Amino acid sequence: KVNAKFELKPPPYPLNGLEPVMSQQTLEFHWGKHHRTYVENLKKQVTELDGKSLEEIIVTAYNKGDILPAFNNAAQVWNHDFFWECMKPGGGGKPSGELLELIERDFGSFEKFLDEFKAAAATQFGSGWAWLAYKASKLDADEDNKLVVIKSPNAVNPLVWGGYYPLLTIDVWEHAYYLDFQNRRPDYISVFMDKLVSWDAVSSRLEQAKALSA
Ligand SMILES: [Fe+3]
């Protein structure tokens, strides 16, 4: 976690690991330039913040929405770390086990959840993120302890709310997709879900989320 000599964390696969769906070129820019830059700038800004955790810096700098200078950088480092963990070579398909059950419990069906997640991703105007998060007051009316789809602008993530545990994200900043899809953000989102998403990753987060909100 902490901001010592913090370094950029590589994705959990080689930069060509997601070919042909997300290009090596996209990885090289998105991770090697954008993500790297957030890391470098955060380190320059980070001070009373020195040696604090990424998440602590994020929640404090959000400042109820009147954000402090380190917020954008800290939140984007975390968001991109999380984003790389959300995908895998040979990803896609459907979740299983408790994640699938909960998704069916809260959205009726996986397909309904998929459509809701894709619409959130598609309609976030400008730069930002779409999320699947576990909503639980014990994290911080009885509904409560359930999955939600949320879209957020710019660097904002569900950690700043809170009572939300992020489970899945898709980056909808144009740099995430422009080299591969240009304007076609819906096709990108669709392909992300069909081919890239690591349901194993999302399931692990859900276990952590349930443990934390018990
Ligand atoms: Fe990005």
Neighbours of ion ligand 1 (CB under 5 A): 171, 173, 176
Dist CA 102 CA 98 (whole Å): 6
- The method recorded for this entry reads X-ray
Helices 199-213 + 97-107 axis angle, to 10: 80
Q: In total, how many domains does the chain have?
A: 1
149 CA → ligand 1 middle, Å: 19
125 CA → ligand 1 middle, Å: 15
Name the residue among 175, 214, 149 with its Cα closest to residue 28.
175
Contacts of 204 (CB under 8 A, 6+ apart): none
Give the structural domain span for 29. 1-214
49 CA → ligand 1 middle, Å: 24
Query: Resolution in angstroms, to 1 decimal, for this deposition?
Result: 2.0
Contacts of 135 (CB under 8 A, 6+ apart): 144, 145, 146, 147, 148, 163, 164
